[PDB]
Symmetry: D3
Subunit: 258 residues, 6 copies
């Protein structure tokens, strides 16, 4: 996929460039000049991560070093594109998440902060985490554990704490909290299993599990484990049914009768 995904992005960019002379250079410098998603993504992220104390051009090298050391980062990033193209009716182009969508930017920003975290460069990981919170309005602790094929749609107000886990193929909307409880260190954030769909505004708190292919109703406050393949809703949330599909993250059906 990752190779075909890149070629399509370049094809789309050539077309957009021709269509919009105000953005022709933007499309060229970010995408068309480049050979790989890595080069395009590092540019775009460095611009979002830009601060007075560490300009974009300096930031880009850090991003490039993470991408070179861990090939899985760029590849997750390509899987995250497909996920959003597939699940979001408002996105029908592969170049869109890469260029435009702050939830996508914050997610790949996270991957870089996480790599830093894992190298022991914790100050710099904290610095990136909090710049992303300011610039993308998404707050993901660098020690969170996040899989691939993830869609963060709209994303304003997403909060993902330190010991949170998000497995492959999860879809999360604006204003979702995967939050902690208490003042003590240790496991205290939710574990979101594969295929889970989380509607706008949901709050999930404590070290609790959300089982495979569960659906979390929009506006839910979840304080206890959610069984696999159930739909929950309410404040606090209770089981209200069973999702129409095996992996409700892929289908994005917001209804809660099930």
């Amino acid at each position: 996929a990752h190779t075909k995904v890149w070629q399509t992005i370049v094809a789309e960019a050539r077309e957009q460039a021709e269509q919009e002379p105000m953005l022709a250079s933007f499309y060229h410098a970010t995408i068309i000049k480049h050979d790989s998603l890595k080069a395009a993504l590092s540019y775009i992220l460095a611009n979002r991560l830009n601060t007075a104390s560490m300009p974009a051009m300096a930031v880009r090298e850090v991003i490039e070093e993470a991408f070179a050391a861990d090939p899985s980062i760029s590849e997750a990033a390509a899987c995250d594109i497909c996920a959003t193209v597939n699940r979001d009716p408002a996105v029908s182009m592969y170049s869109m998440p890469l260029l435009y969508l702050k939830g996508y930017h914050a997610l790949q920003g996270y991957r870089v902060a996480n790599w830093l975290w894992r190298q022991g460069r914790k100050a710099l990981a904290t610095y990136f985490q909090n710049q992303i919170s300011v610039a993308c309005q998404v707050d993901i602790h660098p020690a969170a554990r996040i899989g691939r094929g993830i869609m963060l749609d709209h994303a304003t107000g997403i909060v993902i704490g330190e010991t949170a886990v998000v497995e492959d193929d999860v879809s999360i909307l604006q204003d979702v909290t995967l939050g902690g409880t208490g003042k003590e260190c240790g496991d205290r954030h939710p574990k979101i299993r594969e295929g889970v769909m989380i509607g706008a505004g949901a709050k999930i708190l404590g070290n609790i599990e959300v089982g495979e292919g569960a659906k979390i109703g929009s506006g839910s406050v979840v304080l206890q484990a959610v069984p696999p393949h159930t739909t929950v809703a309410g404040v606090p949330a209770r089981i209200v049914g069973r999702p129409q599909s095996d992996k409700p993250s892929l289908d994005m059906d917001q209804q809660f009768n099930g």
Copy 2:
């Protein structure tokens, strides 16, 4: 109202300039030196939309182009000022929405992006949409249809999706979603009719009508059509009462069970 509004804005600006030497030049350059709201607003929005790849000065031209081609836009903008002064007790000056309020900026930004969208300049429309999301923390699809006399108070976390309709004289607080459902293209976002008030944090999802003068309680999750002149609250929302005025957007009474 249009020129009374402009003349009041200029008079307030002169007074504020005299009072705050740190901001005299800001008041002069945005307001006092200008003949219309168009020139003031193009300047202020240009600064909000500013990015590395397209600086304010180049952005201003695109804003001015939309204003010159569609006169209703700046008409709507003046109308939105009066909306905010009338409805929001924390705002007693006509220059305040214009100068300061990110909800106001996001909304006028949408008008320009919508104009772009309507000319087939969709990449630039998308560019502006997402820059506004980043800068004003309000995400409105440029294809959404929004009337006039709209107040977006505080505004952080507002999402309004592709096929949404918002009629004249609506009030919408922070963290409100007018959201979609499913992965399929097609009509899938709410239709908010005239006079509706939407309390903070409400989520409304799917292609459902919210009838004229309905009141959506704070924190509500709305999945079904709301009868006109009805008050809904809860997760998921149900009818809890009926508003006394025909247009609760005008009065901003946040109490429900009434």
Copy 3:
């Protein structure tokens, strides 16, 4: 506390400067160069409040004037750091709130805006409030009355309106609104007494008392006075339980009924 807090911040700063060469100069310029919290905080705050019309270097002088004229401001700033270290398991360094946390930045920003407001410098206070709202995604009316030992964790989407009161030792999470009701001037915003804990996404509206040591459940919509030492939750919120500690803000137990 004052001196011990600053000396600890300097020691951490020296330690971090040695671990991270990309940030050695950042740590030196903000912290290690300085002999008080005021110098460090004015610098960091100036950068966050930076706008085209009033650049950091200029803003910084305004912040310092406030710090010199009202010594209670830096003291409160010191107290809030301790509050965050003690209460947030993800923060174990005193220099972290100062340097990184937008909720912290926003709160100390409010303190400068409030001082300006108390001087009659209202245009500038409003300028500040709304820049903080855009840059930190926290919107606090400069006329709000806020005590000390306050933690705003994560903070995206926090709204605190004109007549709101927040006493000492309160903890408030992302997406919380202390909001108003109606279109008229007058007292209309919540009074949050000492010891209160407000979970993510809670909406409290109108001139209502939230009693000493109450806990407000995540996602709650509060329309009526909350008795002291009570836990409320729901949409609309009802009594679901009672906290065990006198000041649930100190413990951050998100559980309810609880």
Copy 4:
């Protein structure tokens, strides 16, 4: 010439845009999207004049105001383009002076500052003068009187003082001074008449005439009036020959002893 010049500039810009994808947006935003030289030039000069205290976008309005009030300014500007294309073998394109050459920018900058000066806006005139000195390394007093068909080639170190006069059709190379003498106010700068060429590094000092079609050799120091149609060279300069054309500014023959 005026609209042939503009139309040629637009045609060249379209070709350059096609050739250089890195600069397509630059060519479009400065030239291709515009109807006149005025709009192109106001954009380009605004960027050159940009400073912390007055950004390009605000500067553009002042430039456009001068252009609207005094039509001769943009007339002069087009005439200066043709001067540079005709006289300078390294320049074969009409868009080149407009886009690239700091001598050209400094000169059109002076026209705007001179307009300001003539309206009594002397602080802003002085602000622009000195910003041009810093940005273009050309220092022209706004009260100087400069005609049209002027070429400032390379331009670094050009100084032209308060009471200087430069007539139409003059050519002036880098490091040329039209300088004053004494500490007293009053007429004390050269009068350079029509057709004069001034070679690199020439210094001309005091209220002295340089007669029509005189040629000032490179490196000359001129302290006395120069007869029309005369060639001077040396430190201090003396007559060394006579030019064959009536207007050596047109031919740029740098040889002397002839």
Copy 5:
């Protein structure tokens, strides 16, 4: 003087502020808000010294530290203002060199680099020296020794090397070199004694003395000691007469018959 000079600057600034609304805030933030030349000068210099790697706000502290450690720096800076007001017919206001003139900026920038040099902070002094060369087009080695009452008029292209000395009351115009000879370390730059006037373009090379109250002809190349109270001119320079006055720096008479 230094006290009266400051009060006049504030009086002038209040007047300019009232005259030019585009610059009212600029005048307020730089001058009117302030109590001393130090505060105004550090602001203005920090803006000129601003680079990506060390923003203005960071630079200002370094400047302020030099001013606090060595009171003679601010006081020389006030004497340099008077010198230029007195000697330059184009400057009749005390606020002008401070705000506008790059030769003045470069000179006071030098004083700060020199203080750094003397403290052993040689990297930072070199960094400031070369930023001033880029931003003001004046290259003064931090180890140069420069007195007070100095006017650098127009200044483009001034070069003052490592072992150069400039005593009190010297006036230097654009494109003057006080330059070195050879490839060996040690004394190799000129010693400009008190009262000396140096015309535009002069080149003075080698460890040679220019005696009190000498006049250096514009465009002179000086390779041997110049006797006190003589006028030299030519390439290479010879004695052509005697200055009309005791201190030709004060009178600025460019004539060279004497």
Copy 6:
């Protein structure tokens, strides 16, 4: 030389990072992070060439493409560093030209512009040339032919035109012009052969030979071929003597007759 030069630069950099905490990160980001001159030089050059229309991060990719495509460019850059250390008594560190010296920046910038020009990318080469002229105050036509071991000391005002040739081991000071004559295309700029030294402010014009090992006196105006191993000086320049060394550029003896 290559490897030894880079290793020395890194060692100095480490040393300077420890002496100056304000610059530790600057030294790390430009030098210590990197394993070749190319990475360090591309970064520093990008920042100098930074413009609104093409920011540093984007420019950097263009510089690197040139460095990769033509290995002779970095080699020449290495050689020029050595030339400056050896010849300028005020430079004893190999990292100084790289980091600080605009003449060095401008020359290496020329090398990128020249490469672009040789690819047919002439708009971009012209864009670069003129940005260098504004930012470094050196104006070198991209079609000029320049060798290696070149020192441009101080550099303000240097002009080198289209058909100029500069062979290896040439030293050129501030305010030197290698300039053209006439309005026609064709060979018209000087040929400066190996070993030549050009003193401050010298003007050499027309398609004339400056022979191997010549010395050009400061302030000279050269209109005719200079024999090899000759010293010329004056306006216009005549033979005044003969250099003792074969390559006066290596020794920098400014004396004439000499």
